[PDB]
Amino acid sequence: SDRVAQLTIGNSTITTQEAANIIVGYGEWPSYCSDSDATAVDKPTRPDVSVNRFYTLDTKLWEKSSKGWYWKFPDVLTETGVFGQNAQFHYLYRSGFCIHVQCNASKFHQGALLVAVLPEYVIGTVAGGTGTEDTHPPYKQTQPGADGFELQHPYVLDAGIPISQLTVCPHQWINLRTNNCATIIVPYINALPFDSALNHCNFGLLVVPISPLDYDQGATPVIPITITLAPMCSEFAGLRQAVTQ
Amino acid sequence: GDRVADVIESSIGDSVSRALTHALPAPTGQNTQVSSHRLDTGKVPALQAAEIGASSNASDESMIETRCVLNSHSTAETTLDSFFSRAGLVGEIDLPLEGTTNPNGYANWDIDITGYAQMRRKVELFTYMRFDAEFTFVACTPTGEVVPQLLQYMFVPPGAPKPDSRESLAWQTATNPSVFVKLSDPPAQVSVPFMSPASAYQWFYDGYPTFGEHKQEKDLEYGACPNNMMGTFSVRTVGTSKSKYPLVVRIYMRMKHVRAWIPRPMRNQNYLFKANPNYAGNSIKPTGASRTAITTL
Amino acid sequence: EIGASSNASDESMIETRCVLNSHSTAETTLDSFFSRAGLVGEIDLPLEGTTNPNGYANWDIDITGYAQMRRKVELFTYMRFDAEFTFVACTPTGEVVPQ
Amino acid sequence: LLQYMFVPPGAPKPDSRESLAWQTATNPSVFVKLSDPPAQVSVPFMSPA
Amino acid sequence: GFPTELKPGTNQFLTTDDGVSAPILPNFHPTPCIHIPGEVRNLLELCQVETILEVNNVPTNATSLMERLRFPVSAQAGKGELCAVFRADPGRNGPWQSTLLGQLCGYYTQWSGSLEVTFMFTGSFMATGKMLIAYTPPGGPLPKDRATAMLGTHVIWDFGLQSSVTLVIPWISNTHYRAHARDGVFDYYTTGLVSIWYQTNYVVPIGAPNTAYIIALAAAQKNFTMKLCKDASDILQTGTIQ
Amino acid sequence: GFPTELKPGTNQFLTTDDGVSAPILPNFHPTPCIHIPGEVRNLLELCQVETILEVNNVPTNATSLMERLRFPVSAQAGKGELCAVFRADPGRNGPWQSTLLGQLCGYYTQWSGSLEVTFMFTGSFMATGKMLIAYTPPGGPLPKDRATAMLGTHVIWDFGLQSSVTLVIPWISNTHYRAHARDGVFDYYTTGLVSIWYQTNYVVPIGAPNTAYIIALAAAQKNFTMKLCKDASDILQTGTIQ
Amino acid sequence: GFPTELKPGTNQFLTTDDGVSAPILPNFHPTPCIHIPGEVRNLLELCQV
Amino acid sequence: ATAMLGTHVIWDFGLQSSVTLVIPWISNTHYRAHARDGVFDYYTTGLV
Amino acid sequence: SHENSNSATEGSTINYTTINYYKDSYAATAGKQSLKQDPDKFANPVKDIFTEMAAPLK
Amino acid sequence: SHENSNSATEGSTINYTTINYYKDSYAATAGKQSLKQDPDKFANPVKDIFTEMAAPLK
């Protein structure tokens, strides 16, 4: 009655019989931009069902040695379905997100994944190792797309900050002996009412194993982690030709 | 007009962001109520499910037998203004006589407070901040001596001409705000408003400032947010002839009327550069101290 | 040709939304624009020179010797105003002497 | 010009004239000249007792 | 005396400080103010007056400066050819510098508002034509063809008794205010591009010039405001003014 | 003029002085503030959010740092063996340094309040067990055995559907506030010790791992407050930041 | 500014002067005062013992 | 990734042994005749 | 305050809110000006005003 | 005082008690802030809140 759940939006429905409730980032549901917060004057377009639906974008394999991965929003969807097209044809974009991370195993497997959302997740480099070289991360690392990217130094989140304090952000855990999914609802987070879906990534989704995956020889060794997400209250403005970046 | 049902009953356009939580006044630490032994089935405060993502709701009252304690300890000193409204160093400007830096009697400093660790680490606890600020300017020679010298500080906002010499025409300062003061006078001090084009300044921007191909040679612009670039602070000795004294200007900032959003993990690796969170990859250190065994102090 | 500016507005050229604009117009008042002290005169009193080596000087009150201030006031033909004048003195190196 | 700084228990004590602790971002500091009148401030009752 | 204590700031001269200063002429009374036409109250009043936009800012020799005030149109081959282009950025180097709006804009760090450019056709009464004027919001590169420009905000202009048409450059920004845009990171604040294409063609009968000119007038809409006073980028003086 | 008299303090610059200073931009109006989620009002709001406590703060090589975030439990021999121990002192060098509470705690000289540590068992569903978690108030040396630990404040944890259990470290102090404790006379302010023992044993059937991990999350109770602002013990910078 | 005129005494530090001085710890709140026996209010109380 | 763009259900094995996929009536015509290879594929319902 | 009315703006169509310590009003601060505007005086000084919808020349 | 409303906190969910001598509010002191707190926004942002006595997962 808190373990079972159904998430229906658009022409897609998700089910889970081993949930752990739902998290609503910073305690507030997504919403459309009010006429007093807005600034751009053109009438926005709100596609609704064609873009506010669940998209399953990627599957990673959880291994005994995995370090963790991250994805950037809205980067992950800029080239998928109708949402992508609208993000490409419009200068302005804004929306919320419902993130559903899936990972099931057996009552004999163990391990725990920390699933968290970190706004304005700026990536840092190791500065040439000695820290005397001012290097910068490449586009494929700041905006990895749907395939995401693997963390090199999870302890410091590849940005000189302690992952041990990541729980100060909207998060959930996937502890195999307890639940097989994590659901986080995120409102639009920015210092502006609208912004570019291409140049700016509002937040990053981190999925990091804190307690290593383990099991005995003979049990299914392939344990996938699938990422499904849905935009909420998508709004677009500033129409012109399509642009990919 | 609207006639088909799905349109009439849609929530498309709801601008009211529903909030699950609300603030309550809390001027003092919560009190402790009396409690006694409880030997029940069904009731189990001690057991939690951290997976949910929420913190434990268990309290002293339900874990041990407590007494009543009227707690009048204030919560005042942990407000944002209490924490930040304390002047700290955010900039140094040298005006040497014989040097390799600013030997021409003037200097331009890009307003950027991320050059000093103490102040930087405090503001980076939050992602977005909006505030006014009080700026204090302390001048003296490199020995701390006070000399009879007149200086001119001028705030050059983006787009205004940056002085290129001690006699530059821009010092006419007909529109930009300038302060003329003596090293003998007390430190100059002024109030600065919230000047960003955005609703708040942001210590982190996971994006690029422009469109196009973001090739290797432009990656230095990743994370650069013009909304945070308030301009230049220019200083000069007032005269057509070189100063007789070497000078140093220390800049202190005191935030006030502060609002902050989105807390984040606190820096645990030394800082290296102003513009980014780069860290020395070969010196990744634990967040804190360590010990020999988990079973020994 | 009439000599008037276009009366066309956003509302009638594209489909617009409602925007409650609370951006102030305060900083563009005449006082906001002009009530900022600027340089309008320099007077030299050198010891050995060709100009005012006698320890005194007469300056004809005329603020048109400096471009920044001049260009701003010349945007208008007629102006009426009071003024605050500030006098900054020092040696040519910017030194302060007991004089 | 001098700098007085109050370093409460647990705050880093400056170990030199150029110590980083002089950034005084949180501790209270007073900058004053020997030429100025004596510096003067009010201190509250700070004991845990 | 009354116990006081000097605080930092003491003795400083802040050029924008709005204080009180002793009056030099006690009991002085100014000449009464008679009525004078054209009093202005706010610089925004002037930003709404259209001035000539130098779209054709290419000729530089003294004898050809006047040609900057107008650009040409003429009979084409019906391939939806391009007529002209320019950035909409008002406080940026380029065409807008010829306008009073662009100049006043230079005394402020940030601006916000919709813009409008009115094009007046000065060809002969017998000349007809249809042009497509488009506004491409940020992120859209200069349109390669008319079909691409047409995807943005645009107006289709038909020559006739009404000599002019107005293109509105609606305020479409991410931030509430834009700082002056320039090459580099500050291109973040660019307004976009304006392109003019032939919708049909410039047509004329026997006896009338095959080339005519268009004059562009620009100004700001009533939702336009500016903030954070600053000195203009120019200082019109080389040496001392004698 | 009005008779005044300067008093001591005159001309000094006190960094925590809350005064008035002349505004540099007269009549300036800031960009309106739109709604932004997650506004914080008091640092105490953050002290109540649990973060990972590095009980296992022993590995130091880069490749093994993540192991500090969790400690192990495994099948024993039923002699009520010891699992782990750590000081409860929140503002002291050790495990608490990994937590946001410990870090924020570093900006205040004194604190007061109850603490709570929640332990989450990440073993497999088939693993069972019962642990004794104890809190020994000041004066009690590290318990030599379980029988000694059991004499203090403790919780007996039973693994089951509820993956976690919360140990409350109730505020038991002589003084109303404690300063940060460290070796020496300031140990006067120590909070005490926390020890974890096997109440029964970690049991598992054929087919499931014989070793599993526990993750510890710590935060403060609602009676927790802090006073007397001070700079943190660390300054994250070696040379000048360029 | 407001017309003032410094009078003799200016800048002096009188040890028995009862004045106001800037507080170093804004918004600081002292540890509450519990009851303690034997509070004295006036030295004359002791002269009678 | 391509299938996911249409109407779908994500099924999680558990105590409830079954899950229901609804094939909602999405047609151009009010009625469909029986579909078969050829022009009558006009009436096809789709794929699962 | 009972001072002299010797300010440059005495009798203006816009009232000000100022501070002063002297008997001569011009010694006062700049204060705040009234936010009134009249763009038409410059942008639309036509005798017979024409609507937006209609054609200016008919 | 009749000044401008140009403070960073103008229109905040917490009222302040400040001092100022200038026409621009941001020149004012920091003052005292309102002692309101909302820990749940971060510590307990769950959709369906669960009691202390009951078992979080049922």
Ligand SMILES: CCO/N=C/c1ccc(OCC[C@@H](C)CCN2CCN(c3ccnc(C(N)=O)c3)C2=O)cc1
């Ligand atoms: C006589 C004239 O006297 N004039 C004085 C005067 C003094 C100070 C003034 O301006 C104060 C603006 C300050 C508060 C903004 C500091 N901020 C906000 C965001 N940000 C930032 C964010 C992310 N990254 C970086 C980065 N550098 O990588 C940097 C900042 O540094 C203006 C004028």
